[PDB]
Each structure stands twice: as structure tokens, then as C-alpha cells.
Amino acid sequence: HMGAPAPVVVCYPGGAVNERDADQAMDAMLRVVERVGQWPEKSFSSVFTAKVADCGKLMAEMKPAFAITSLALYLDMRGQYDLVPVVQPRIDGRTSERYRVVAKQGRFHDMDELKGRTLGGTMLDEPAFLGKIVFAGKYDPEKDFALQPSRQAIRALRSLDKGELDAVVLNEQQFAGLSAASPVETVFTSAEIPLMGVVANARLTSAQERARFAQALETLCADPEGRKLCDLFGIQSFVAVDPTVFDPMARLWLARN
Ligand SMILES: [Cl-]
């Protein structure tokens, strides 16, 4: 890098935070990581994309030591870039989340009854996570359902209310915001799915370098500036982890019908 900041690739799948404020927040996060980890300022810089399709190019080009990706991107790229976890976020005491399929009250009693019906949600653009992980490989979403992707869970839930959609797959945060019309009910709750945090290329980092970054993130949410960043994303803390935390997901990821 010859004195330039080292790149940290951030593949932001999307979320409650708009792209521009999420990108700014990554820069702010790195400034806190540097302070709490006692790096000189501008040791790192964020290379940000909200496009899943560009994540791979950014990884190959920037050759980053550290990155932030979705679980699906990690599982797909882990072998090529010898990726290992650095930290997971803890949210509401848990390092995992559950997805809920909701539908108008009384219409459907199980997912099998939604076969051939139309599904909405914000995580439908990349349906291998929906099929292999959320549904534990019991359904092939593109074959068994009509996936109507949405960019905002509000849009999907409006369509459900109208009757333009039969059910909506919701994250924890989206399921919490439901209250804020037609009666609805949860038709399906996923198993616990681990949360992604930061990862590292183990061919480009030492174990001790990963540990320093991890420890910095473990203390980030206590910092005056870091606290506001963890609030923005609803994060309780970050926790350092070994690779086995995602081994159960790797088993689901390999399964095919
Ligand atoms: Cl996920």
C-alpha cells in the first residue's frame, strides 16, 4: 500500500440504513477501530458496494485483509479467499436471527400450502440463501414459488395487504416493524441462522493481526463514537469467533435436491 490506507471491502446486502449513510458509517466505524485498536489514523479505508454482483470483483481487485459480506457471499467465497470469521454481531443477546413467513390470518396453515403461490420480501433477489438456509433445503424457492422481490419490506407488506402477494418473508427487524390492517399470522419460522460480521483473508493476515482487529471491534460499541454506530445498526456488541460458528451453515449450503 506504500503508506496508503489498507482497503476493507464492504458488501452491504442492503438494510434499514440507506446506502449513503451506511457507506459513511463504515468510514466512521474504521476511524473508531483505529482509535480503540491503537492504529494510526487512516490505516484503513472502506471500499463500499451495495451491489452483490460487484463484491467478487472488489475482492479480487483490492485483495483486502478484512471484509464485510452477507452469509451467502461468505459461504460462496470462503474457499477462494481463505476467509475466516473475525467477529459476529450480538443482537438482542443472540449471535443468530430467525426469518418469519407471514400471511393473512386463516389463509395458509403451512409452507406446503404456499407452494405455487407468490412470495414477497427483500431477500428474494438471491434465492439460494432463501432455499438452502431459511427453508433448510426443504423448498426450491424459484421452482416451488413465484418470488416477487421487493426493495422495502413496506412495499411487500402493502402488496400482501391488498392481496397482490400471498405471503412475505421478513427479517427480525422487518417483523418487529409490522405493527407500525388485514390480520396477519406467522406461517413459518426458520431455524436460528448465524449473523455475519467481519471476515478476514487468512492467506493475507496473521492470526495475531486478526486478533487485534477482533479485539478492536469487541470494544467498538463502548466508544463514544462507536456507540452511535452500533445503535444505528441495532448491535449490542461484537464477539470474536473461530470458523466453526458457520460450519452448520456450510452443511446446509452443500445440500441439493
Ligand atoms: Cl442471513
Residue numbers in the entry: 22 to 201, 205 to 281
What's the paper's own text on this?
The aerobic methanotroph Methylococcus capsulatus was the first bacterium shown to synthesize sterols, producing a mixture of C-4 methylated sterols that are distinct from those observed in eukaryotes. C-4 methylated sterols are synthesized in the cytosol and localized to the outer membrane, suggesting that a bacterial sterol transport machinery exists. In this study, we present three putative bacterial sterol transport proteins in M. capsulatus that exhibit remarkable specificity for C-4 methylated sterols. We first used bioinformatics to identify a cytoplasmic membrane protein (BstA), periplasmic protein (BstB), and outer membrane associated protein (BstC).
